[PDB]
Structure 1
Amino acid sequence: GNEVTLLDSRSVQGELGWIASPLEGGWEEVSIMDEKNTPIRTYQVCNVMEPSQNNWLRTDWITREGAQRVYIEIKFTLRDCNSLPGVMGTCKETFNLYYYESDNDKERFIRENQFVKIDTIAADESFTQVDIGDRIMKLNTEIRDVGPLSKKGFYLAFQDVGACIALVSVRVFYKKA
């Protein structure tokens, strides 16, 4: 209608290949297979037993086209710290969401401290259901907005500090309007 996608993990061809740090043991690609046997590309991490997690994942460079304000819609699922057996003084039920404004569409290592926190993201009231045949993923849907943006594009980062989290859909868009 008047929404215009700059990124939709769901419609991407082949692996996302986003940058994770650490590269292994932190955030990792996981395909959920839908009814026609086509992967939904997720990122997940569940090191709830180990202390001081600090796992980063960043998208590829995303252009803002003309837009000063963009909307980020995350479809996630958390596992409660209650539900996982075992002791866990550092378990979490949120992740952090950051953005970084850049004119360069090929930065290799962006420092954590150039990143600008948009919000801490928890399972709140809002959800979506996605019918994938054998199951219906009930997921949280959060939406945040950011701006005003001025540089050509930007990067999104997701920080985990000890949650059991599956990021199922990341959509970015602006309103043509």
Structure 2
Amino acid sequence: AMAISDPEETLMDSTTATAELGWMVHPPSGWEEVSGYDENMNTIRTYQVCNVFESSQNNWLRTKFIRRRGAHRIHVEMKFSVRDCSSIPSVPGSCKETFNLYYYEADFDLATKTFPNWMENPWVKVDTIAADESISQVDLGGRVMKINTEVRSFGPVSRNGFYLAFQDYGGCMSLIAVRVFYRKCPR
């Protein structure tokens, strides 16, 4: 990355949400929206989940419908912080420090509280996401935390739109930003 990277068309970006994000949380005891104002008094809506001391966790967070606007391949950039299991006093055997990213294609905004079902098949899993040793920092509220930035892509996608979902299964983490985009490409 010395040469400037290609423009990317942004399909969605949580950091530009004027109003509360309204992502669907299943179950509501799992992820929860937390709003932390940044450096310029811009507030960032984030989601976090930390039920490390509850068993059988399977916590889904699903975005709003996202229009594909032409792309066939989708890139998803995620900034998040994860607490290492080994840093948690009395940490149980079940503790995890990754989350899974999924997508689900739809021709229109058809999802509800129960549909699609909350599991891989009908969701497609993109990958299990882990923290790097590559960390930056941001300022949210008073404080500066370590954050990782990971990008994954998937396709081909053919329907008009899709949703993403993020699943925690027993870790402690904060999803601070998500940006979905595709590489803008002159044929």
TM-score range, shorter chain: over 0.9
Residue 47 of structure 2 corresponds to 43
1:29-66 C-alpha deviation (Å, 9 max, x unpaired): 00112244332100000000111100111000001111
- The 8 Å contact of residues 37 and 141 in structure 2, kept in 1 or not, is answered as no
- Provide the aligned C-alpha RMSD in A: 1.6
Aligned pair in 2 of structure 1 residues 38, 104: CA closer, same or farther (>3 Å)?
Answer: same
Structure 1 residues 2 and 37 mapped into 2: Cα distance closer, same or farther (>3 Å)? closer
Match for residue 116 of structure 2? 110
Alignment length (residue pairs): 176
Identity, % of aligned positions? 61
- CA pair 92-6 structure 1, distance change in 2 beyond 3 A: same
Match of 1:154 among 143, 147, 162: 162
Q: TM (normalized to structure 2)?
A: 0.88
Match in the other structure for 1:94: 98
Q: CA deviation at 1:86?
A: 2.2
Instruction: Please give the TM-score of this superposition, normalised by the length of structure 1.
Output: 0.93
CA contact (8 A) 1:126 1:142 kept: no
Give distance in 2, aligned partners of 1:119 and 1:107: 22
Structure-2 separation of matches of 1:128 and 1:74 = 13
2:152 maps to which of 126, 130, 144: 144
Q: Does 1:125 align with 2:133?
A: yes
C-alpha separation between the residues in 2 aligned to 1:10 and 1:127?
19
